[PDB]
Design a protein around this nucleic acid. Sequence first.
RNA 1: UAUCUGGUUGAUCCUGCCAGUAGUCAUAUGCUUGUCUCAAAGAUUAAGCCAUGCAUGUCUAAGUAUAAGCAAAUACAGUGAAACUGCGAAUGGCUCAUUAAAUCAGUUAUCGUUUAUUUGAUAGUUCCUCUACAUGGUAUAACUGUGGUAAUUCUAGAGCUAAUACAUGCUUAAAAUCUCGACCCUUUGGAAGAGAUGUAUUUAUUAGAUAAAAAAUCAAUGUCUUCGGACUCUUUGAUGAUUCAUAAUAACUUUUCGAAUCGCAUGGCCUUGUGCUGGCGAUGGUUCAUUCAAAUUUCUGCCCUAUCAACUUUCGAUGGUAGGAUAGUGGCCUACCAUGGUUUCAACGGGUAACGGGGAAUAAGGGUUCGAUUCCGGAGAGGGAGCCUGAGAAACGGCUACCA
RNA 2: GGACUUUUACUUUGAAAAAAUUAGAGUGUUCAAAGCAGGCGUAUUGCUCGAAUAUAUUAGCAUGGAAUAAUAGAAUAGGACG
RNA 3: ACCCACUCGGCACCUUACGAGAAAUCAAAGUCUUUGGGUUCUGGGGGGAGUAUGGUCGCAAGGCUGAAACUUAAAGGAAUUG
Lengths: 188, 260, 146, 49
Amino acid sequence: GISRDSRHKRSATGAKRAQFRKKRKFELGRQPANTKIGAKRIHSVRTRGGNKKYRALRIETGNFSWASEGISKKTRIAGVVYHPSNNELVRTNTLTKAAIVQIDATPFRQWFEAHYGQTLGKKSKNAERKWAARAASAKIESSVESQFSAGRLYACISSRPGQSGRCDGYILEGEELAFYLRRLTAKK
Amino acid sequence: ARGPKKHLKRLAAPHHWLLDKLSGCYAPRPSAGPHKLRESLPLIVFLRNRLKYALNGREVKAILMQRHVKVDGKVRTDTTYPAGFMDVITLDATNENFRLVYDVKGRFAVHRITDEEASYKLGKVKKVQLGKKGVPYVVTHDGRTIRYPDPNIKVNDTVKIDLASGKITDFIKFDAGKLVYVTGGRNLGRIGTIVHKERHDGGFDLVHIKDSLDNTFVTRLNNVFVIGEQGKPYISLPKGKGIKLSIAEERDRRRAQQGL
Amino acid sequence: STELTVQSERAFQKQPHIFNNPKVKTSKRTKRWYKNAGLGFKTPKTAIEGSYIDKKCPFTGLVSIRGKILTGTVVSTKMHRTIVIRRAYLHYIPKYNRYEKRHKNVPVHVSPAFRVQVGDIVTVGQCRPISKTVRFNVVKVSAAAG
Amino acid sequence: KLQRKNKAKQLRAQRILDSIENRKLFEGKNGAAKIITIVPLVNDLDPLD
RNA sequence: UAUCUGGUUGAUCCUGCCAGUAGUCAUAUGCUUGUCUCAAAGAUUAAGCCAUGCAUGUCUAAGUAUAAGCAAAUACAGUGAAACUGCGAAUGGCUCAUUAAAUCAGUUAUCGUUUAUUUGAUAGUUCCUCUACAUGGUAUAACUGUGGUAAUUCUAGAGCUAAUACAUGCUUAAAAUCUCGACCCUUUGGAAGAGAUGUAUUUAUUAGAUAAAAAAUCAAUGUCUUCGGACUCUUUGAUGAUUCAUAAUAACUUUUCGAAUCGCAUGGCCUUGUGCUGGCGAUGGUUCAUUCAAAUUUCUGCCCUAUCAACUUUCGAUGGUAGGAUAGUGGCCUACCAUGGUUUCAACGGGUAACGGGGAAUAAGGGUUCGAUUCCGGAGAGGGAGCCUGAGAAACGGCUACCA
RNA sequence: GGACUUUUACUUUGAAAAAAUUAGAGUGUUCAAAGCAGGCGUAUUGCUCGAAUAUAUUAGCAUGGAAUAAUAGAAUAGGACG
RNA sequence: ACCCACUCGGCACCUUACGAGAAAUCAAAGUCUUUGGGUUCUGGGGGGAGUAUGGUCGCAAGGCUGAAACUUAAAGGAAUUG
């Protein structure tokens, strides 16, 4: 099919390389899988050695991780909001690696009260020493606590959807989040 | 060519098999096993061309499928099993035990040993790492792996597995003086002591070796197989003790033999 | 090549799997990972307290220096963060018992820790093919005339 | 090279047509008759056997 | 192992080329042909065309036997067609058309990857805060009978039945540590009982230290002294080098593996029950290592041509960022942004009646010429392209399409 | 274990260097082209040698030498040593 | 200005062969079978042929670069003798 060989490309001196053998199989390439949003559709792909590569053709409910708090909760995905390589992948809502999307924030919001005790946006006395031991550390960054009030977070996929089937990632936080908000207000 | 090779044309064989260049156009080609095929010795070559027990190809097959040849304490049936260096193969029918060790010329030489020492075998440790679940393991020079070694064993040393259960007995370190067998290159089969290890960063460490007759030679570290302390080995050395007589003085060594 | 602003591209430029904690505040500012290339090569001062990223530098980056170590003179630097090295040698024609001069052009990668111009005898090392033609990476820089 | 390669093809293809058309006399199904004479040389030799 | 001689040359001397002479592991052809050892052979022109036959199939005690097969243990048990399953068919053999930094040679690299197989290690955790495990379920081939086609290694519908086929499915120690907490009794707080903790995948985070030594600080603040507060031996492997090996935490997964298989023997224990327990192997299985490989890769080297001086970027040309794709690096492809990259040290184009090399002939030395061909490497199976199966094939004694 | 440690060419020695082919050692294939065989005994359950060595001028790696041939350094001292 | 002596740099002349050449002759055509100071260009038997073809410069006349097929045993140069 597609080939990844460098023998079909012009040399470093501008020379044209004449073919010497047919296309091989240990140099093939397969057609890209633009991972959309909707019902779960996962296809297996048999690879060299007999392995498998799960092409995610349509994924949702990915696993997103809070980097500072060190938790991972399986949340929904609202859609793509920014893409650094191709602008048109935002327009068709195609999930790739390093694509900035919007995730459901209620599993992370629900985790906060059961672990820290405070409530963002607005009995069993063993639980309050758990709250008091973890007290004086429940202060988080100002932008992400404002995002919980809207109910929708910002996150970046750190997984390869077309190479593992899963659409994982982590939520933006800190200076990296400060970079991407500037991108959404000056370019989007 | 689309997959692994299965044949070996005679004249593409290792030269130290001493195969007759006529008499068929194919060579044994040892299958995959504990040794690389250019440093091994198949069971067909050993029992037909070297010991002259068998006479044909089907006759050496009848040797093995009778379950008579025990390589490293285990029975084998593949005629092209790569029996290699320091393999301690035994013949229960004749109560004779062999250790495949290099001659001074460089080719594999038959060396009859006792029933004692036919139960242990030296092996050069080639890589030590941590396995799964935190266990450390070493891998020797014939593909064997042993879990839980002594923590002082490093790369390029010698361990003494016995035959039946691994179980590394006392080991030999690497420093100045230790007796060294050479296992590759021009000095293949010579025995001497280390005098100097000039470490080179980037690759191919060189080792300076002086033998018992004060003839120094240099070799790469890959070819170095330490076998014990100065003048006290841990095995039975082959005939000639690895001295590498010159071509003139071998002839004078011959001349003392013919006649009476 | 020179000094630019860090986040100029369309994506955030950071060292992967290096995470600075926005909760705890330390006097040491930014988590910067760096290593040494080995082979008796000293890390430049600019690589340790720099601010660039350069995922292909042998220091502070995700590549390795293994294999051949070469030497030549810089003849061009017009590319973005890569240069071209001229290697000059003599070739022996056996019939005539004589030599003849030849040359070859090596495109290497230069980190933003070395300030490299023309001249500049440069020591490079083999570096895990990084773009189609560039298999080496600048390690040591020595001056031309001062 | 391609003009050289084509010309050798064109001269051989004309040659192989020449051999077939010259052999059009002897496709021995309808339009052919090869005339064969058995001439024994010895009186003690019958052409019938 | 080192010799020359004739044409020109008419009397002489030289430049000069031709002819003679000898070798050929160099081809043809003519004449002639007794003996022994040894042996190349449709390469050159047409990588042009193919009648016919053969060239890849395979069973041990150890996957499946109700052959209405043969021959002598009341489930079978000996030999054994057919067929299902597994494995092989990707090796060998042939040819040299293509191919001019390509192949190839020697030397490096994978801290940039895949690996059936052999060799060595490697699985007390599965359902569960009410259950088939002295063992779950279907389909079918072979076979029986009925048919179609002129024909083919064509097959349809109908009835049967097995697995190491396919699809499900469970036993097994105690301890430890974490979250959640019946809480109570009043604290410098400590507590019943609920869950979780294999492996594989994916993401995020942490540890993975170590140039020699002296105090004042507060916060988390612990065992003990004499509650003044004193305070220690503290665990860390390898490389030249790692975000390495490995481990820990939070989760994720159309949940990967964790034996429903087969042969040869009848051992031991008593509570003497068809109780318990147990030997020697065979085939499978996850991960790691190893071996046989493979894919890419570093430096240097190739014949003739200037009547080829500029070439490469339309249609990736050189670099950067990000993604996709791959077994994996990489303009390999895509989106954007730079304007580069090679060359008189011959780039680029053209020719090769060019596969490269080990090597062959020729001998005073250096050289000249040759290498289709017994070994190594590359490529192709009339021309192109596309792909299934599998560890491995862009396979042609495999398939599909187009052309001839 | 830290560092200053000019950059080369050249030449010696060595390592890693497929077999076959070439040179060559041993060996009465009846001699030889070859082949890697064989030889000696009480020829009654045997003994035993051998299957060497060299050549490869390029490129890469290691080391000895420092003539020959290049290269750099203190002239605004912005130079060295404590 | 002329004479004598020396010197540097020139255009040349005469004798000779220590040498060189096929010879005429040569202080360079020497220091070359006892063959290497540095470096550019050109030639490889005669006709076909400075022809054909392409490129280039020229207003043009032309110039520069420049083959092969085929055929041939010659093509020459130096000195004397009848």
